[model samples]
Structures are given as C-alpha cells and as structure tokens.
Target: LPTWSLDSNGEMRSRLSLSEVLDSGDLMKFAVDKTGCQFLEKAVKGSLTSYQKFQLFEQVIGRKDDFLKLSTNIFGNYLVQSVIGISLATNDDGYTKRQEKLKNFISSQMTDMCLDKFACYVIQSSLQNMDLSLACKLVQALPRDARLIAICVDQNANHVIQKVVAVIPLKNWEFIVDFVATPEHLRQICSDKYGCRVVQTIIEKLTADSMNVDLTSAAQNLRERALQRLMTSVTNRCQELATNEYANYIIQHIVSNDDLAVYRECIIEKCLMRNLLSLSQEKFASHVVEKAFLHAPLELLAEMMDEIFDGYIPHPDTGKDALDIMMFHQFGNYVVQCMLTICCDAVSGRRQTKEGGYDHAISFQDWLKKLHSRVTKERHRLSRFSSGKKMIETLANLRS
Candidate 1:
C-alpha cells in the first residue's frame, strides 16, 4: 500500500507499480512511467536535446492513441503545457528540429499505411495541435514515399479521387487529377460504357468549380493528355452500347465553348440528326425531318451536306467515277436529290424494304456510291478558304 513518491532528484522510481503493470500487461497503467514522468519534469523545464526530444516522441507515439484519448491528464509537462509558458525564453532550434523529425517519421509511417487511414491520422494529429506546416510536409511525403499508389489507382481507384475532390486545395487539384484522375484513370472508367458516363459526370461536376481557375501554360499539356485519354476511353466504349443510346448520350452531353457553340452545334446536328435520318422509314422520315432540319446549322449548309454524303461515292467495284458520271458532277445536287427523293417518297407514303431490310427507295450500295462520289469531290471545298476551282469541280462532280 506504499504510495508513489518523487525521490530527491524529482525522479519517480515506482518499483512496485512498474512490476505490477508489467506483470499484468494492463493498458491503463502501461501508459505511465515513473522514470519517464520524472524525466519530463526536469526535461520540460530545462534545455532539451534533439535526441531527448526524439525519445519523448518515441514514447508518446508508442501509446499515442491512448495518450490522445486522455490528453487532459497527459499535458502537465507536455509541449503544450510547459513550452508555451516559456515561449520567449525557449529557442526554436530544438523545436524546429523536433518538428522536422516528427514530420519525417509520420511521413514514413503514413506512406506504408492505408491512404484513408493515413489521411485520417494526419488530420487527427493536426487537430490535436501537431505542427500544421509539418503535417502538410508529411501529407505530401506520403504519396511520393510510397510505391503502390500506382497499383491502387490502377484498380479503378476512387478512394484517392473522392478524398482529393473533398479535401485537396483547389490550386493543387491538378496534382490530384494527374495522380488520381489521369488519362489512365479515365481510360479505365471509359473501358466500361457505364464508367465512361461516370467520367463525364465527374468532369461536369468539377468543371463548375474549375471554370474560372486557370492553369499555367505548362499545365495545358497535362490537361490535354488527361482529356485525350479520357475522351478516347469514352469514345472507344461508345460503340458498346446500342447505336441509338450512343446517339442519345452523345447529343445530350455534347458541349461547345462560346467560340464554337454555333459551329459545333451544326456539326453535331449533321452527325446526330443525319444518323437519325438514316434510320427513318417512309412514315418516320418526315417524322424525323423536322428535328433534323431544326438542329442543322444553316451556317454549315455545305459542310453538313458533305458529311451526309461523303460516305457513298467512290466504289472500287464500279470503274466509272460516280462523281463525274452522275449528272453534271455537282455534289450538293446529289445530296439534295437524295433527300428530295426521300421526302417525296415519305410524303407519298411509299415504303420498301431493301436487301438490308430497311426502307430505301434506292439500293444502299448505289446510293452510297453516288453520294460518295459527289461528296469526295465536295470535301475539297469544305474550308472557308477553298479555291474557286475546287468548289466548281465539286459542284460539277455532283451535278445531276
């Protein structure tokens, strides 16, 4: 029943208490050390060595979770209790060196542990008054110090992405993107049709916050690499879904910046609506006609015409050049003729299923050849700077 006592040197040597706790392996009493307690009493008051500081940290960190829980009882001779009282009297050299060691140790530890767990520990440590600037260094060191972040990320990783999206600084978001949401990551998502949609959703979600945030010109390269990889993934998987669904998703999500909205809308109209036009029957032709025309960019009349027809003209089988052979070789004329025919037939309520079991007044092969011949010639005049001779030749080639 002997009580604990501090000897003349202010060192508590509790032989009986230590024997009991060590024998029992009791977690509660295991936290306190008579010698360590005495050591801290004098240590916290006098000049301390970096080695001594390291020893202190080693002991505290060994039972850190428990110490952190009983933090109130733990602070008497602690850094927070004693150091601040003598801030002006104490030199920062020891403090700074100790801080750096703590940072290096935590960084090394977190690099080995689970990222979420490590991040959680880091945040908790910071909240408990660990050095904030040092915590930042440790956090950064985690990813750089580890080898397997690459592996974890390769497994369609979302933990890092989710955490970064929620907690990372906006300025440093690009690093997160490069690390967690890279072209590689996006491609993984795009490999699955559903995942591609998710990538698009993620992009759309971040774009709102990132819209005004500008990247350095060097960052543009990284951004473009990410975009290309991500878009390639999405587009490659695009074919996995039904063409109708692909068309719907593409149209619904199509985006054009202010500078190209008009031009891009027109291109999409040609790609999306024109494809729909191809799927139409005599009854549905006129049904879809209005929608197609409504979305078509009048600004790109000839360009759209070229897109719609370019698939058809030059056949290796037919030695005759359909462009020159068809009428006066006017490409737009051929496109106009095909559409007029479809329109007339749709209005006349005439329908016939061709060899492809689709409604077509003309054979697909012949129609394609005629269209391609004219369009190939017209493609030469696609740009605004097209020469007069090319336009004339294109017009003459499709003339009918």
Candidate 2:
C-alpha cells in the first residue's frame, strides 16, 4: 500500500447519508445549490417514507413560487425535472391530477419560461417525460408569427425546439420543417449558432434512423416535402455552406451519408472538386473535405486524388505544388493525414483499425505506388517542414 493510504485511516462521517434525510421540506435549500441539486435529484427519485415524499412534493410542486423559482434556477431546474419524473408516476384519485396540474402550470408559462436559459430546459424535460397529448399542447401554447423564429434562434430556447422535434409527432412539429422550407431561410439558419444544430438534428432524424416505414401518410408527406427542401437548399449552397464555421458540421454530416448519392456527387464534384486545392488549405472547408476522404466511394476518391496529383499542378498564384502546399500548409496538413491512412494498408501494421474503405475499393499497392513516388520526388524539400517530415515517417513505415 502507498504511504498515504497506510498512514491514514478513512474518515467516518457523522453526517447522514442523503437518502436517510427522510424529512420533508429539507429539499428546498438543496434544490438550487449546485452540488446540492445533484443529490436532491437522487433523493427525489430514491425511496423515502411515503408521507415525507409527498410532503416534499407538495412543498416543491404544489407551491407556485417554489415551482417557478426552481424551474429556472441555475442548478435547481434539474431537480424539478427529477421531481416531475416521479410526480408523473404518482398514484392519484381516479385520474392523474398531478399531470393535469403540471399541464396547467406549464401551458400558461410556456413562452416566457422558454426564453430563460435555465427555465427552457425544465420545459424540455417536461416535454420529454409527459404524455404526447399533454406535450403537444404545451408546444402549441407558445406564441406564433416570427416569434417562433425568435425562439428557434435563442441560445437557450433552441434546445426546447430540438426537444420538440424529438418528442412530438411529425404532424405537430411539422412547423419546424416549415421553418426551414425556403432555401434562403434554410441558408440563414444554417449559419446561426444555436439554430444550425436544430437543422442538423432534423436532417439526421429524417434521413438516418426514425420509424419512417410505419409513419402515417401525413407525416410521410411532411417528411418528403422537408427532405426535398433540405436537398434543394443544401445543393444550391453547397460550396458556401461547406466553408461556414458552424454550417461545416451540417455539411460534414451530409457528406458522410451514403444514401444521398446525388447530394454527395453534387457536393463533391460540382462544388468541392472545382475548389479542391483552395479548400484543402482553408479552415472550415478542410473539415468537410476530410470527411469526404473517409466516407466517399472509391470512384470519388480517385477523382479527388487525381485533382491533387493533376500533372503536379502548382497553386494558381502561389506556384507551390499541390502536395507540397498541403504538406506544409496549416489546415491543409490534416487532409494529408487522411490520405496517408487510405494509401497505406500497414501504417503502424496492416491498418488494423479500419476494416476498410480502400481494401474493398482496390489494392493498396495501386495507391501506395503513385503516392510514394510523388512524396519521394519532394523528399529533400519536404523534410524541412514538420508536416512533410511527419509524412516521411508514415511513408517510411509503408511496406511498399
């Protein structure tokens, strides 16, 4: 044993374990304190004497001031959520009167509470846990007009928007799809900080993994219209959006989706290939490029590599060769790293990590031979930059 462990005995607590508090109303102070909230979340969910539990519930939920303060409290909102989770399950007279009370409080406070940074999450959690019937009404209770757009772009409340997409039915949340309907509107939100993610989440849920097969015709129609609009806006703005700071993430997700062959082809050939060298050296665009390297089919990969190797084309104005520029360029060098992985089957050893993109596409020997010859030609000058020297080391490991 270590000296610290051997020399000192663990201290025993005279303090009570929180679950043992077993007292009503003790929850109030702890409900909003930072560390206090975490334990309160636990104690609220854990078993306590029936009378004590209901008493704490009445103090926290039955009282309006206590409820509102806790709902938006920096730390307290989470405990209120935890309380709501339990309260929803509580047995009441022939009906869930607690559920009805929750609906009444929230439906009235919907929009104002949504704008508060902390309070928004209380609503989000409520939406997630409530019955769909109750949840949609709360969503409907918020204001209309460009007011919805105001909430959509809010740093705090946008999360509530995302939660709406998550928990509500497609018909109820179809307005969210309408929010992104126009290419101009979609492009606008694509660049906004919090709003971009809501768009990404919507696209991801529609394309990747929701129960679309069992979806009703109305939802299916909404899905088609939404997807069509998404495709149109993204295609029209592929080049510009791919380079945007926040929008690059959305582009990256779209790039990796194998289903969108036309979108991928449009983005890769029409947008990316035309600007390949410049984008390879850019900040945001390079990230989207890196994803294309990892996810695009071999046909697209070959065309991309051909651009880099196009008769050793030099930068239009700068005159530096493609590999030479990217090898030493700041953002550009990361793209080179992805290239190194695909070209070598035995980077550290037989490319054990990827199981594999190029393996099915073609033999590594085909890619390795050309890349090696080209890197060797520039080895003398390449050795000067760390990026080039790093490439040389990975190149050195190549069995080729």
Candidate 3:
C-alpha cells in the first residue's frame, strides 16, 4: 500500500465509501417571521430539507446578492470550468461523454459569464493550433443567439486567418470568403497591423494555390470580399515595390533584363492567365501589356523571345500539322529577329516618331520585305519554292 493512501493500514480495503452528514432540526424560538425565514435558510443551506424542497423557490427567497453569488460560484463558473476542463483534457474515446455533461451544465447556466469565456477559450485555442475541426465544433456549440460567438471569431481576424492558411485548399476558399465577407466584423478585424499582415499572407497563399490548380472558375465565383482581399494584396505588393524609387528602378532593371524569363512566367500564370480571359481580347491585350509595362516594357517581340528562349512556341498557327510546322519554323524566325532589332531600338531612344507614314505595322511590313529578299535571293534553297505561294497560304491561315 502507498504511504499517502487513506487506507494505509496493512489490510486492503475492498472499496471506498462516502458517509452522509445530516443535521438534527433546531428548536430556537423568535418572532414568527424572523424565525420562519431563519429556519427555512438553515434547512435549505446545505442539503434540501423536506419543506424547502417542496416550496417554490420564489416564495422562499432569501438574500439577493448571496443567492446570486452562490448560484454563480457553485453551479456556474466554478462547476463549468472544472467539468469542461476535465472533459477537454480526456482522451478522445471518453471526450464526447464528458462534453455532453459539460454542455448540460452550460445550458443550465445559460447566461453564465464563464460560458462566454469558455467558448472564447475553446475557439481561440483551436485557432492558435490550426485545428479547424475543433474551431467548427466550438462555433457549433454556441446558443441560438450565437451571433456573439460569430462576432468574436471574426474579431480574432489575424489569429484565425494565420491558422486558416494552412487548412484552406481550393474547395475551402469560398467558405473562407464567406466567413470574412461579413463586412461589419471584417472591418473591425482588419483595422490593425496583425490583421493586415495576415490578409497579405492569405492572399499570397491563395494566389499561389490558384496557380497550381485550375482556379479560374473558383476565382470568378468568389464574392466581392474574396476578390477585394486578393486584389488588395497584389496591389499592395506592387505599391510596396514602387514606394521606394530605387527599389522600383531595380525592379524595372531586373524585369527589363532578358534573362529572368521564369519570373515573367510566374506573373503571367498568377495574374494574366488567371484574370485576362475574363476580358475581351483587346482588353486582355491592353491589361496584359499595361501590367507588363508596370514591371517591364514588354512588346510582343519580347514575349515571343521569352517563349523562344524558354524553348516554347505559341500554339500552332492555323494550318495542317506538317504545313503549320513548316510555317512556324520558316517565317517565325525571320519575323522574330526583324521585330526584335527594331523593337529593341525603340528602348534605346533610336526610333523617333517619324512623320505620318511611319506606322509600326508599316515598318514591320518593310522589315518583312527586307527579310523576304534575303531568304529568296541569298539562298538557292529558296528557288525551289514560290514565296507568293507561301504568302498566300500564310494569309489564308491568318484570315481563317
């Protein structure tokens, strides 16, 4: 036997038993009213007496503060926290049973201050650990007037979202959007530094995830709040870069450099391909070019070179497979090289705006004419094929 055990005698006890202590009734006499009240109080004070148990509580009302405080302490906060703490601390197999008991106590003490604290602690602990299943469970525990719990969850915006980023997959983005879309709570939650940081992190995560998955339809379906949050993050990152003139200049330098093609791919994937299809082709081109220029002054020539340097060719020009292959290999190189020489000169300040006759299209045509002569005249291989036939075929494909 352990030394600290109450049954520390050498003999073993079969079971532990509890004894009841009952008080004998008092016979003191006093004024009728005073004695009656004191007698009732003493009877009901510890265990229910026969008369006190049968009488309506209202008829036997006693000290107001003492009763309220007594009810709150013994049957309210103290009881609930103790029961709930044990329940939550239990292993999973036993948890539901203990939780049910604690929940009943919470209901009995419905307006209990400790209930609110318990709910808050439950939700907050779940959020802190990124245990979203627990979070949903705690949220469901709220009473029908659970607007308060929802409001509290929304208020812990930063903490909650910081946790949410881990759990949010493509399917759950909509739910997250719905959660934060409540403008009243969202406004309160976002009005501080931590919330702003969390907002940015969430946006960045969503954008990255969208790139990995086909999220065009998902992004479209998102209500205003999700879109706003995402767009805000993108614009903020840009604004941060642009805030320092030197940083912006360095950004432009890196972007303008011909080699950082992978970064361009990322921008195209995250921004252009995701959002551009929603606009008309003209608008799409404009948005793409404008945004590209914000980072680097990209021309079609630059985009084409980016594709070529990375060993990609654009989707095949309209033609039969073999003919399309012939055309892409044949004229594509000449057109790209000619366009690059002239377009790159514009960046060097050499291509001044000439008088009315000098349009970019016209200049490109002239450059094509130059390349046409070289391909035909300089190489005997060109004599075997008709340039006019190739031109007709190309134009026909373009028209279709």
Error (Å) of candidate 2 at residue 295 is 1.6
TM-score of each: 0.33, 0.74, 0.29
Among all windows of 10 consecutive residues in model 3, the one with the lowest summed lDDT is 22-31
Off by over 4 Å in 2: 1-66, 74-79, 94-98, 142-150, 153-155, 210-225, 259-262, 311-320, 346-367
The TM-score of candidate 3 is: 0.29
lDDT of 3 by residue, 140-244 (tens): 443433343343334343344454455444344345444443554344334434544444444445443334355465554553346455444333343233223
Candidate 3's C-alpha runs over 4 A off are 1-93, 99-122, 127-132, 139-157, 167-176, 179-192, 209-400
| Candidate 1 lDDT by residue in tens digits, 270-324 | 4444353243222222223323333333333333434444534455886443233
Top lDDT model: 2
lDDT of 3: 0.36
Q: 15, model 1: CA deviation in Å?
A: 25
Q: Residue 316 CA error for candidate 1 (Å)? A: 28
Tens digits of per-residue lDDT for model 2, 40-92: 66666667666655765676666777888898898888877877877777665
